[PDB]
Amino acid sequence: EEEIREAFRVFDKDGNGYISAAELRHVMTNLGEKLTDEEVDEMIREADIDGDGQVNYEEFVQMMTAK
Amino acid sequence: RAANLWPSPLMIKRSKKNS
Ligand SMILES: [Ca+2]
Ligand SMILES: [Ca+2]
């Protein structure tokens, strides 16, 4: 789970401890499959459970590590 | 449904570790 924890730091470029839509864009675009803003938003829409629009630590953990 | 794309850079992190 180390890579997941460190990933949050790699995704967060502004250094606020939060993965914003604009931040996720740069992450998922460099990945290769560059989707549209809507799809990027969709990503966090299904990656958001607390109802804030962004993915926090807990949300990131639960979404990635689903039991 | 790009959810799997979230684990995509995540997997890349593990790949970057190998790299
Ligand atoms: Ca950030
Ligand atoms: Ca949230």
Residue ranges of the domains in chain A?
1-67
Q: How far apart are CA A33 and CA A50, in angstroms?
A: 27
Q: Are A7 and A43 in contact (CB under 8 A)?
A: no
- The answer to whether B2 faces chain A, any CB pair under 8 Å, is yes
Q: Count of CB atoms within 10 A of residue A51's CB?
A: 5
Q: CA of A48: which chain B residue's CA is closest?
A: B3
**DSSP 3-state percent helix, strand, coil across chain A (nearest 5):** 55, 5, 40
The tokens for A27 are: 């992450």
Reported as type and span, the H/E element at residue A46 is none
DSSP A40: H
The tokens for A33 are: 């499959």
- The answer to whether A31 faces chain B, any CB pair under 8 Å, is yes
Nearest CB to B2 within list A32, A35, A64: A35
Reported as type and span, the H/E element at residue A14 is none
Q: What was the structure determination method?
A: NMR
Question: How many angstroms does the Cα of residue B18 sit away from the middle of ligand 2?
Answer: 31
